[PDB]
Design a protein around this ligand. Structure first.
Ligand SMILES: COC(=O)[C@@H]1C[C@@H](N)CN1C
Ligand SMILES: [Ca+2]
Length: 223
């Protein structure tokens, strides 16, 4: 997250870190057994880390649970990043509490202008490179489809939306991948892609979660 703020320990209780020897992506806890992340975060050997603030220090509220299976969306295209969503099942159910909690799925899509919270452990620099240990947060509005499309000609599908600031300075970045965009208590987005970070007229692009609620529910119901 570039131009954000320190969230505060365990203030984003649905935020998970995906770890394969190191943090490599964010995710969102949607029930005791399942995490939603980006398809471009797919790899084998994933440990889901819940209750994290400082990802380099065991602070006492963590739960570390290995993934038993990952399900990348059937229509994910890694070239275009269309359908950039994946589900991860935990080997054992997380113990839910005030600091480890699921986030609700949307019942409808969120509009341009809706204020959201984007979070993660990604790069905090727009030019250089610096990775934080503690969770960073950004309040950002969803941008109109038209402004999103004109920012990224030929690249925005019906499964993507832009959020952030056309002036730049505030954005998600590398390492925030797969993490949450939460608006009015609903998971509306997944950190997907962008052209650099926090650059003028290049806002972050996010997977449009409301398009996938049926797939998520049916997948969970049979897996
Ligand atoms: C380097 O840029 C990135 O990796 C991006 C930019 C962001 N808006 C979301 N990402 C995962
Ligand atoms: Ca920790």
């Amino acid at each position: 997250i570039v131009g954000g703020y320190t969230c505060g320990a365990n203030t984003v209780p649905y935020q998970v870190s995906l770890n394969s020897g190191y943090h490599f992506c964010g995710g969102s806890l949607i029930n005791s057994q399942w995490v939603v992340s980006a398809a471009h975060c797919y790899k084998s050997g994933i440990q889901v880390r819940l209750g994290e603030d400082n990802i380099n220090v065991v602070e006492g509220n963590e739960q570390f649970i290995s993934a038993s299976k990952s399900i990348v969306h059937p229509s994910y295209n890694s070239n275009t990043l269309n359908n950039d969503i994946m589900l991860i099942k935990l080997k054992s159910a997380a113990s839910l509490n005030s600091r480890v909690a699921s986030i609700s799925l949307p019942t409808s899509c969120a509009s341009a202008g809706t204020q959201c919270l984007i979070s993660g452990w990604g790069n905090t620099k727009s030019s250089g490179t610096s990775y934080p240990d503690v969770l960073k947060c950004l309040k950002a509005p969803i941008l109109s489809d038209s402004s999103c499309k004109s920012a990224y000609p030929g690249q925005i599908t019906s499964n993507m939306f832009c959020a952030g600031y056309l002036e730049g300075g505030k954005d998600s970045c590398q390492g925030d991948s797969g993490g949450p965009v939460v608006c009015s208590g609903k998971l509306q987005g997944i950190v997907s892609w962008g052209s650099g970070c926090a650059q003028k007229n290049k806002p972050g692009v996010y997977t449009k979660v409301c398009n996938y609620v049926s797939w998520i529910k049916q997948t969970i119901a049979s897996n």
